[PDB]
Amino acid sequence: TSQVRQNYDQDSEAAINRQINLELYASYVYLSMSYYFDRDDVALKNFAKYFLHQSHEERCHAEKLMKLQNQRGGRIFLQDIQKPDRDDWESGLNAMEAALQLEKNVNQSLLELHKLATDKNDPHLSDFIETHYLNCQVCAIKCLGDHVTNLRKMGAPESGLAEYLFDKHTLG
Amino acid sequence: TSQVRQNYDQDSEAAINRQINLELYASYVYLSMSYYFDRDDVALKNFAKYFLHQSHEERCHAEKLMKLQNQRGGRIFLQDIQKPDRDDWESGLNAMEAALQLEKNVNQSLLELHKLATDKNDPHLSDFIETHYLNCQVCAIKCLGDHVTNLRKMGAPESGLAEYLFDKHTLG
Amino acid sequence: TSQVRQNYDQDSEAAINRQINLELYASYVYLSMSYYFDRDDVALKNFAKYFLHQSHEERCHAEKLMKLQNQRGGRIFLQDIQKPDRDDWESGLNAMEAALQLEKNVNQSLLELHKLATDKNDPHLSDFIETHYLNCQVCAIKCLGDHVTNLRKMGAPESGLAEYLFDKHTLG
Amino acid sequence: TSQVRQNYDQDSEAAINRQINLELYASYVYLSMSYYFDRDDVALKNFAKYFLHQSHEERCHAEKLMKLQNQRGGRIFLQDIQKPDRDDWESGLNAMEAALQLEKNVNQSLLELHKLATDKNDPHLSDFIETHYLNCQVCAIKCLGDHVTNLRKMGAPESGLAEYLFDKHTLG
Amino acid sequence: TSQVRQNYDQDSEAAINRQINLELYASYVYLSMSYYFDRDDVALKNFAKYFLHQSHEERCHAEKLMKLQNQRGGRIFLQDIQKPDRDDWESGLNAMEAALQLEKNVNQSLLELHKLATDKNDPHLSDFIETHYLNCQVCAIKCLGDHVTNLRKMGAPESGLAEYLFDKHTLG
Amino acid sequence: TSQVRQNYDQDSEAAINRQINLELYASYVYLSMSYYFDRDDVALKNFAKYFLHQSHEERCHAEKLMKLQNQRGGRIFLQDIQKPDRDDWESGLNAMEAALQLEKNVNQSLLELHKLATDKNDPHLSDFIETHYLNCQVCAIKCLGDHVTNLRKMGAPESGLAEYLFDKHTLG
Ligand SMILES: [Au+]
Ligand SMILES: [Au+]
Ligand SMILES: [Au+]
Ligand SMILES: [Au+]
Ligand SMILES: [Au+]
Ligand SMILES: [Au+]
Numbered sequence A, B, C, D, E, F: 001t002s003q004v005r006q007n008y009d010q011d012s013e014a015a016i017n018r019q020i021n022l023e024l025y026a027s028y029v030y031l032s033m034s035y036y037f038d039r040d041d042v043a044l045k046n047f048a049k050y051f052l053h054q055s056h057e058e059r060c061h062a063e064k065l066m067k068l069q070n071q072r073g074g075r076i077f078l079q080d081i082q083k084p085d086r087d088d089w090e091s092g093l094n095a096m097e098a099a100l101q102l103e104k105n106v107n108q109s110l111l112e113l114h115k116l117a118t119d120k121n122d123p124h125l126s127d128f129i130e131t132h133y134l135n136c137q138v139c140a141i142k143c144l145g146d147h148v149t150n151l152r153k154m155g156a157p158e159s160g161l162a163e164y165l166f167d168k169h170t171l172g
């Protein structure tokens, strides 16, 4: 037992480990999407660039969760990082739609983690999530929601013109 | 025989001369395309400007090959520079498609030159190509590939709107 | 078949995919080591910081290989990213020793990739490796070799004083 | 017929095309001379550099004539660009003498073009030549004339000392 | 066996040692030439200065080869450094001619080293030579070639005026 | 006989030649030591760096002696430069001890040269040594003496910790 451990529940420790892997997967997903848009047959450079940043974000979000485990005397147990669902993501709209769902899945998971923190009576972990995850997940979700909304009304994905202009004007 | 000659094969010398002319032709082709887009009935100023730079590039690439012949004690033999295939290049998409093919033809030629350099056991010429040609030909090819990909999905060439917006947003 | 493909062998494409995953694994390994040294019972902040940079490096090295696949008309196929061997890395010396071996394994793999590139007669891929991987792998290996050499002669790992001072004076 | 055409005679259009090719040839000639002086057995770096600029000049002079065709609704028809007369230009004096003659030949041609412009009653083309060609051709000719005059009186071409010092003091 | 050794052939190690000594000898040769031109009966200060830099260059080129041995786990074995052929180098032309030959001898040796690297299948050593030696040896050789060409045509070495002016205008 | 010779004794000339070679040998020795500390199994970067400067110093000290020969109308006769005694220098302490001895040997030689200068009644050569050699040799010797003194009292060479810390704190 860590000399620094205090009010940290075995279950929390395991959940944090669980989340650390979830965040890393969401990083792999975005990285994958990114390089999809880098293909000579796809060629949206700002979509590519956008998702590459989303990738850095989720990865950074995970390392912060690794620091948190260490801070509270827990122990990091890493798991295999599961390849994403698809290799070809079809279109800009179809990836933004996949991203939204992903973000809502990671968000769901974070909310679970919050209830657990509360049930175990753990304020430090509860505010840590509130402050550093839940708030920035609502943002991400509205961002993607908006993009999906613009791309649709623009005639996507049946209109490579829509995706092209979007790429330029909104993701530029 | 040049006082500076060393490990330079007669065949290489001839191939370099062969390539020096190929690179100059690709310069004439681009120059031609450029001024095609400068016509009052075509009027894409950034397509024009783009191809004019491609022209300067291929020309510079050739003079570098002339310096290489001199460096290694070879002897430059210039040949007539053959007018290009067409005078009217139809559209932005249709020129970008012609450019891609040209780039792949010059690339083919450079690869030939590399095998020959290797067969004659000539490391200085082999890395010279690797470093100063082959690498920058892969780039050019993906660039053009991307442009062809964007123009198509944009509704080109049946849509002068596609070409116009492309000219502005991507070639600007 | 990609409009940009030229001289790219099916086998190479598959090997690049193979290497892209190897480089990502070496990133996960380092990330893991890093946060090992961030534990309250380990507490070497510069060892932690060092390995975190090694992690960013290998990851960057992989994304560059993903750009290469796209550049040459290949197709990126991602695989699961395998959790590392250990969770507890014992000591500074013992991780530096594990790192050296890892680096030599990735190096081995890169050399394999070079022979294959050559056999398929692929100069662009051959110099790409020479220039962007093999050279920087020799460096990394001597770096780690040196660290292992200093830590040993310092009385590590039986002497937490050695590791501590090293952390400060050499990794600071 | 171009929407912009006005007072432009079929004959003029053809002559401009004729001149566009003449100017490009004079560019190839100079480029050739340049790299002659870059040979290890010749080695006059400023003669080389001088003629390379003359090359850029004539090329620029031609592209300006291509813009002129487009401006007035004409149509550019490119022809093969004829390799120069010689491969070995003998000496500094002997190239400067060949250059003078070339310049006088291109000048002759421009004067022809001026009479034709006048006969067809075409003031815009007449001043275009006066302003952008004829004036700068008189200059070039006196420049070369002077060089030939200095090199001779210096003991050239029988005196590699003359050519060497000239290269340094006048072309430096 | 070095903890860092990988794909490094015994023969290569020995050749590198062989080259390390060759490069150092070429340094001694130049140093010798330099101070020849510093003699009150010779008195060409820029020839002296020129060869002193050539000396620093070859020496630096050797220490880089010593770093390479260490990098790859080889072992440096130094040999006696053989005094040069002559003490009196006669003239500027006659030293530049001796230098050219030396450069071509060292170049020959480097090429040998490249074939060996290739035969042993050693890409890291092969590009190391390509990048850091072969390329910069072609340059040096054309430089010297040019100097020999200028000095001859200037009336050297029968004309101390030629050597004097050269010293000033070209080596200054 | 040199037009500049005055009061310069045949014996002095020969001794200067003798010293020019001694100084160059001491340069080779240090260079050798330097790269000993660059080995992956040794790995003291500041010891390496230190001795590399000592190498530049002794070399510079020799070229100054070559200028002196020329200044006084003597004639430089170079001899083979003898490889050093050892290839493996064991430790930091053991090299610093070898360096001290070397410095005292070169110092001995310089003192011999001073007596000879005096006996031949040669004030210019006597002060040249006093000013540019003897004074800076006393310094070097106390420097090395001190290093040997610190390394010993630090527990060297039985304590790689001593050498490591020394390398950092004193040679850094
Ligand atoms: Au980012
Ligand atoms: Au909750
Ligand atoms: Au956040
Ligand atoms: Au340009
Ligand atoms: Au090849
Ligand atoms: Au290039």
Ligand SMILES: [Au+]
Residues within 6 Å of the ligand: C052, C053, C054, C056, C057
């Ligand atoms: Au980093």
Ligand SMILES: [Au+]
Residues within 6 Å of the ligand: C111, C114, C115, C116, C118, E121, E122, E123
């Ligand atoms: Au290979």
Ligand SMILES: [Au+]
Residues within 6 Å of the ligand: C132, C133, C136
């Ligand atoms: Au790298």
Ligand SMILES: [Au+]
Residues within 6 Å of the ligand: D052, D053, D054, D056, D057
């Ligand atoms: Au110019």
Ligand SMILES: [Au+]
Residues within 6 Å of the ligand: D111, D114, D115, D116, D118
């Ligand atoms: Au006229």
Ligand SMILES: [Au+]
Residues within 6 Å of the ligand: D132, D133, D136
């Ligand atoms: Au002009």
Ligand SMILES: [Au+]
Residues within 6 Å of the ligand: E052, E053, E054, E056, E057
């Ligand atoms: Au220098």
Ligand SMILES: [Au+]
Residues within 6 Å of the ligand: B121, B122, B123, E111, E114, E115, E116, E118
């Ligand atoms: Au070779």
Ligand SMILES: [Au+]
Residues within 6 Å of the ligand: E132, E133, E136
């Ligand atoms: Au170099």
Ligand SMILES: [Au+]
Residues within 6 Å of the ligand: none
């Ligand atoms: Au002069």
Ligand SMILES: [Au+]
Residues within 6 Å of the ligand: F052, F053, F054, F056, F057
């Ligand atoms: Au130094």
Ligand SMILES: [Au+]
Residues within 6 Å of the ligand: F111, F114, F115, F116, F118
């Ligand atoms: Au004395």
Ligand SMILES: [Au+]
Residues within 6 Å of the ligand: F132, F133, F136
């Ligand atoms: Au001194």
Ligand SMILES: [Ca+2]
Residues within 6 Å of the ligand: A082, A083, C080
């Ligand atoms: Ca799976």
Ligand SMILES: [Ca+2]
Residues within 6 Å of the ligand: B082, B083, D080
């Ligand atoms: Ca034709």
Ligand SMILES: [Ca+2]
Residues within 6 Å of the ligand: A080, C082, C083
């Ligand atoms: Ca597993």
